[PDB]
């Protein structure tokens, strides 16, 4: 039912809409107005994906695919069987994600903590909306969004990437990838450091934050601190997602050619554009 310590926190108030209409729990889950909304949307979306499985003709979970409308339909509606189910599922998913963020706001708010978590979830929501809503609308058709399938949206990724050659040459792409790799590195180092401090050589006393700073300063020579590492983690993840959204919003919209052709500008800069030798020329 309740954690040993949970009861002193289960108080009324701190909710955006609906007073105490839905200000109650179902098991551990806090419900709220936006919890009601998000349960509705999630349930409807999962059901409509199952109905897509029925219409398509497979029950293999890895072959179920809900394709967006084809290019000729433009930005209008499509029949449910050939593109409309995708649109309804997209609306359901957007509503579910937004309601989840607002429910998180309500919970953060009943507990008296900052709103960093719904903040950071909004970044992922905006990346999803970039892929599904902003770019296809800016670009003319719902057919540029990805299908809802486990292995068929990878086909969308591959085709979109190879439309512009090697997508590795997108520069915002490189920045986003560097942020992702740095984020994974920092997460591994942080988890390892805290665990090694709390679980020292075996039977000797528990370590202190001073030991963590000492270890990492011995390793490379500059410890960032606990507050520093948590700030850096939040910012690395958010920067990665932001640059992903940027690299995809500019693709097919202001850049239409091979991306190495973008990299071509530095090579042609006046004070080396003509020299013989090297890779280029």
């Amino acid at each position: 039912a309740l954690l040993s310590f949970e009861r002193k926190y289960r108080v009324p108030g701190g909710t955006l809409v609906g007073g105490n209409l839905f200000d109650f729990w179902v098991g551990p889950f806090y419900v709220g107005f936006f919890g009601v909304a998000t349960f509705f949307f999630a349930a409807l979306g999962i059901i409509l994906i199952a109905w897509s499985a029925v219409l398509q003709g497979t029950w293999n979970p890895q072959l179920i695919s809900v394709y967006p409308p084809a290019l000729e339909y433009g930005l209008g509606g499509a029949p449910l069987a050939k593109g409309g189910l995708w649109q309804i599922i997209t609306i359901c998913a957007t509503g579910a994600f937004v309601s989840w963020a607002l429910r998180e706001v309500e919970i953060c708010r009943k507990l008296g903590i900052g709103y960093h978590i719904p903040f950071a979830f909004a970044f992922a929501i905006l990346a999803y909306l970039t892929l599904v809503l902003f770019r296809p609308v800016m670009m003319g058709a719902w057919g540029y969004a990805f299908p809802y399938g486990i292995w068929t949206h990878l086909d969308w990724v591959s085709n979109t990437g190879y439309t512009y050659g090697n997508f590795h040459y997108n520069p915002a792409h490189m920045i986003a990838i560097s942020f992702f790799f740095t984020n994974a590195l920092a997460l591994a180092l942080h988890g390892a450091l805290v665990l090694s401090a709390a679980n020292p050589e075996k039977g000797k006393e528990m370590r202190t934050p001073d030991h963590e700073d000492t270890f990492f300063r011995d390793l490379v020579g500059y410890s960032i601190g606990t507050l520093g590492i948590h700030r850096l983690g939040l910012l690395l993840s958010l920067s990665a997602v932001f640059f992903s959204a940027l690299c995809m919003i500019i693709t097919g919209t202001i850049w239409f050619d091979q991306w190495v052709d973008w990299w071509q500008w530095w090579v042609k800069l006046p004070w080396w554009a003509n020299i013989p030798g090297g890779i280029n020329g």
Partner: protein, 54 residues
Amino acid sequence: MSKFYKIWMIFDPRRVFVAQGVFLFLLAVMIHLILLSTPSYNWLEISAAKYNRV
């Protein structure tokens, strides 16, 4: 059947009624969308063919 009423000494009415309203609306939307998906029972397209709108 007569003493099914004792379910309300098991379940709080508020939570049950919220869940029931959500469930009923979701089920109705389910069935309406299923009907709209099939070429028959898609009443809109049926009327479109009956009056030759397309």
